Amino acid sequence: AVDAYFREALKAPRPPKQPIVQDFQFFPPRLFELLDQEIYYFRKTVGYKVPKNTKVQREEQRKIDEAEPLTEEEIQEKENLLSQGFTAWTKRDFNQFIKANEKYGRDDIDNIAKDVEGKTPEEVIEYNAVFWERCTELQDIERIMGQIERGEGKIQRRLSIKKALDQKMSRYRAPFHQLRLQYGNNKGKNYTEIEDRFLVCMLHKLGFDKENVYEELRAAIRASPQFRFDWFIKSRTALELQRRCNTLITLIERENIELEEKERAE
Ligand SMILES: OC[C@H]1O[C@H](O)[C@H](O)[C@@H](O)[C@@H]1O
Ligand SMILES: OC[C@@H]1C[C@H](O)[C@@H](O)[C@H](O)O1
Structure with a gap:
C-alpha cells in the first residue's frame, strides 16, 4: 500500500503543496495513510472522476467520494510524522x-x-x-542488493587471492628461484615455468591488487636480465599477462586445497 504510493508518485490530480517523501527516507506507514487521505480529499473537492482503466473503477471512485478533510488532530499528527x-x-x-x-x-x-x-x-x-x-x-531493492553483493564478492575474492599467494610464497626460502607450480592439464603450450615463476613472484612483490599492476609487471619483465633473449615474454600485453596470472592463481588455489586435504589425513 506504501509500495503503491511511491509508484503512482514516481495522471491524477495532486494537492499543490503535497510534501515529497522518498522510500529510502523510511517514513512511517501512518504518514502515507494521511497523505493518501489528503490526495483523495483533494480529488473530491475538484471534479475528479476516475477513467475506464468496471469493478475496479467503483472502488477507486469510492475512495474519493468518501474522502474527508483531515481533522485538526490529524494535521498535527501529519506535521509530526513529516519529521519521523x-x-x-x-x-x-x-x-x-x-x-x-x-x-x-x-x-x-x-x-x-x-x-x-x-x-x-x-x-x-x-x-x-x-x-x-x-x-x-x-x-529498487533487487538492483541495490545485486550491486552490494557484487562488491562483497570482489572483496572476498581479493582476500582469497592474498591468502593463497602468501601461503604459497611462504613455502620457499627464495621463491623467485625455487617456486614451482602444479599445472595438471592447464599448463598450455606458450609459457614456461621460468616465465610463470617470475609472473607469480613479481605480481606478489608489486601487490596483486595494485592499480595498474599489469603494466608495472610488463615493465619489470622487460627490465629482468633473465629475459634478455625471451621475445615472447617481453612482448605480451598487460591484458595477456593478467590472463596468465589469473590461470596461475587458480593453480595455486587448487594446490592449496589439496595440501589442506592431505593434512586432513593426519
Ligand atoms: O565535520 C565536517 C564534516 O565534513 C564532511 O561533511 C564529512 O562528510 C562529515 O563526516 C563531517 O562531519
Ligand atoms: O552474508 C551476508 C553477510 C555475511 C556476514 O557473515 C554477516 O556478518 C553479514 O551481515 O551478513
Whole structure:
C-alpha cells in the first residue's frame, strides 16, 4: 500500500503543496495513510472522476467520494510524522551510502560511516541500522542488493587471492628461484615455468591488487636480465599477462586445497 504510493508518485490530480517523501527516507506507514487521505480529499473537492482503466473503477471512485478533510488532530499528527524520517538524506546521499556498501562490504561499518559526504559517522550508523531492517520496502531493492553483493564478492575474492599467494610464497626460502607450480592439464603450450615463476613472484612483490599492476609487471619483465633473449615474454600485453596470472592463481588455489586435504589425513 506504501509500495503503491511511491509508484503512482514516481495522471491524477495532486494537492499543490503535497510534501515529497522518498522510500529510502523510511517514513512511517501512518504518514502515507494521511497523505493518501489528503490526495483523495483533494480529488473530491475538484471534479475528479476516475477513467475506464468496471469493478475496479467503483472502488477507486469510492475512495474519493468518501474522502474527508483531515481533522485538526490529524494535521498535527501529519506535521509530526513529516519529521519521523531521514529528512537530511537526498537521493544522492543514499546512492553514496550504497556505493560505500559496495566498496567496503556490509560488515565494515567503520569505513562506510566515514564515506558519506556531509553525514557524521553517528548519522550513517543510525541510517545503516534502519536501512538493513526495512530495505525490503525499497522499490529498487533487487538492483541495490545485486550491486552490494557484487562488491562483497570482489572483496572476498581479493582476500582469497592474498591468502593463497602468501601461503604459497611462504613455502620457499627464495621463491623467485625455487617456486614451482602444479599445472595438471592447464599448463598450455606458450609459457614456461621460468616465465610463470617470475609472473607469480613479481605480481606478489608489486601487490596483486595494485592499480595498474599489469603494466608495472610488463615493465619489470622487460627490465629482468633473465629475459634478455625471451621475445615472447617481453612482448605480451598487460591484458595477456593478467590472463596468465589469473590461470596461475587458480593453480595455486587448487594446490592449496589439496595440501589442506592431505593434512586432513593426519
Ligand atoms: O565535520 C565536517 C564534516 O565534513 C564532511 O561533511 C564529512 O562528510 C562529515 O563526516 C563531517 O562531519
Ligand atoms: O552474508 C551476508 C553477510 C555475511 C556476514 O557473515 C554477516 O556478518 C553479514 O551481515 O551478513
